[PDB]
C-alpha cells in the first residue's frame, strides 16, 4: 500500500543494494581518508569518546545506536566539508529509511570502528579507506 | 538581508569554493568513469544529440544552457544509478543556487564536452575522469 513496496523487491532488492553500495564505497572511504588527513586531536577525542561509549553501552540497542551515530558524526565533522557532510547525511538517512539483531555481529562492529579510529589517528589514509570499505561490506553482507 | 550573504564572503568565498570543488572532483569524475564503463550506444546517442545542440545553439544563452543541462542529464542517466543521480542533481542545484558571460569561454566549453563524450564512447575511464576534472577546473577558474 506504499509505493516503495511496489517498486522494490521485498526483503532483498539487489539493484538498489548495488546502487547504494556503489555510492557508499565512493563517498565514505573518501570521508575516511580526508578525516585521516585533516582530523585534529580534538577531533580524535570526539571520535574516541563515541567509540568508548559504543564499547561500554553495547547492551541496549538504543544507547549503542545513539553512540554509533555520534561516532560517524564526529568522523564526518573531522572532514570539515559542509557540502560533503550534507551529502553523507542524505545517504545515511536514505539507508535507514529504506533498509531493515545487531548483537550477533557486535564484536566485529566494534573492531571495525576501532580500526577506523586507529587509521584516522595514525593519519593513514590507505588504512582509513580500507576500514571504511570493510565496514560497508559488513553492512551489506547482512 | 539574506543570511547566505551574511555567512559567505561576497563574490569569492574561497572555503565554500574549495568544499564544492572537492565534492565535485569526487563525484563527477566517478560518474564520468562509470558512464564510460556502462553507457550503451543508445546512451551515446542521447549525449551526442545534446552535444550537437550545444554546438548549434551556442548563440542564445538559454537554448545553449538548455542543451548543456540535457548533456549532463544524459551522461548521468548512462550511469544507471538513481542514488548517485539524485546526489549529483543535488550538487548541481546547490552550485547554481549559490554561485554566479559564458561566450568568452564558449569554444573551450564545447571542446571539453566533446572530449568527455569521446572518452565515454571510447569506454576510456581514465580519459573520462580527466575530461570531468578539466571541466570542473575550468568551471572553478571563473
Ligand atoms: Zn557504525
Ligand atoms: Zn556543461
Author numbering:
A (entry chain A), B (entry chain A): 79 to 178, 183 to 224
Excerpt from the paper describing this PDB structure:
DgoR is encoded by the first gene of dgo operon and negatively regulates the whole operon. DgoR was previously predicted to be a FadR family of transcription regulator, and repress the D-galactonate metabolic pathway by binding inverted repeats in the dgo cis-acting element using D-galactonate as a specific effector molecule. As the representative member of GntR superfamily, FadR family is characterized by the presence of a helical domain at the C-terminus (FCD domain). It metabolizes D-galactonate through the enzymes encoded by D-galactonate operon (dgo) and a modified Entner-Doudoroff pathway, where D-galactonate is degraded into D-glyceraldehyde-3-phosphate and pyruvate, and then enter central metabolism.
